[PDB]
Write a protein that binds this ligand. Structure first.
Ligand SMILES: CC(C)Nc1cc(Nc2ncc(C#N)cn2)ncc1C(=O)NC[C@@H](F)C(C)(C)O
Length: 290
């Protein structure tokens, strides 16, 4: 509940003065998003993940997300969610300290970033389950994630799914905003129009399920089709099948359970929010799959 307050200068030292070069070329950079850069850190015998908030066009605004990340982190602690260890305010330089995830993000593991071997269909089902449980806990606690994507599903040594990035998270199937925030490749139709509903989180999870099946990122500029959702259309319009897209980097994948995960994904991806299943139903269908 109550978080440790680190001083900016402690964090600078622990991250080799926020060395922005990738860990692959001897830097501290593990990844980046639109609102910040994540660094590897070594605080008091603990390897940590330091997210330093930054405009990658946002104002501050940034501080609103900082207060929101801590507020949700204080109330939401669970087996399938990341754990915040601390924070740093000092001027415009805002940092959040997390538990270091040895298997990084689902997005990076599906693309085998840095020579990691491809994920077994067995681990993929475990991840899908864990990721769904984390969303259930957030919803049961009247919270909408708003940024469900494979980059925001982190993995430990045992490949346990851990939902991250709560900077956009909101306490709660029809609320309204103005100013649309999130990742468009994953965003539900209603979400792109201002609607704040837990049903949007489910849609996004369907996009994640297709990435899990195919090993393909939601959007790829140098791919035909660019969008993974266009391949969902091709399946539903008999122009192609799910087998034509099952990740070729698997051997333990059986069309039986693969078609089952696709069935769940298809329901998650219903155009009309009320036709989509709730998180508890998604959980049921995934536990039924194995
Ligand atoms: C950056 C990402 C691609 N990557 C990570 C995120 C992370 N923790 C973290 N926790 C919570 C939040 C938030 N909000 C962000 N980051 N811990 C480790 C990583 C990471 O990259 N670990 C290294 C492994 F991916 C590997 C050794 C295979 O490179």
């Amino acid at each position: 509940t109550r978080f440790h307050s680190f001083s900016f200068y402690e964090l600078k030292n622990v991250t080799n003065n926020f060395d922005e070069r990738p860990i692959s070329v001897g830097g501290n950079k593990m990844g980046e998003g639109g609102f910040g850069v994540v660094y590897k850190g070594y605080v008091n015998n603990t390897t940590v993940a330091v997210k330093k908030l930054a405009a990658m066009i946002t104002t501050e605004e940034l501080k609103q997300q900082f207060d929101q990340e801590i507020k949700v982190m204080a109330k939401c602690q669970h087996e399938n969610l990341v754990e915040l260890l601390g924070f740093s305010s000092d001027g415009d330089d805002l940092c959040l300290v997390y538990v270091y995830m040895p298997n990084g993000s689902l997005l990076d593991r599906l693309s085998c970033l840095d020579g990691t071997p491809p994920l077994s269909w067995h681990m993929r089902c475990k991840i899908a389950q864990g990721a769904a449980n984390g969303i259930n806990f957030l919803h049961e606690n009247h919270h909408i994630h708003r940024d469900i994507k494979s980059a925001n599903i982190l993995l430990d040594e045992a490949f346990t799914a851990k939902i991250s990035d709560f900077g956009l998270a909101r306490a709660s199937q029809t609320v309204m905003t103005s100013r649309i925030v999130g990742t468009t490749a994953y965003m539900a139709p209603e979400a792109l129009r201002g609607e704040i509903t837990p049903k949007s989180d489910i849609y996004s999870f369907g996009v994640v399920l297709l990435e899990i099946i195919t090993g393909l990122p939601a959007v790829d500029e140098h791919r035909e089709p660019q969008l993974l959702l266009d391949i969902k259309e091709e399946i539903e319009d008999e122009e192609k099948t799910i087998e034509d897209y099952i990740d070729k980097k698997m051997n333990d994948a059986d069309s039986t359970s693969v078609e089952a995960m696709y069935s769940v994904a298809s329901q998650c991806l219903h155009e009309k929010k009320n036709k989509r299943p709730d998180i508890k139903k998604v959980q049921q269908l995934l536990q039924e799959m194995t």
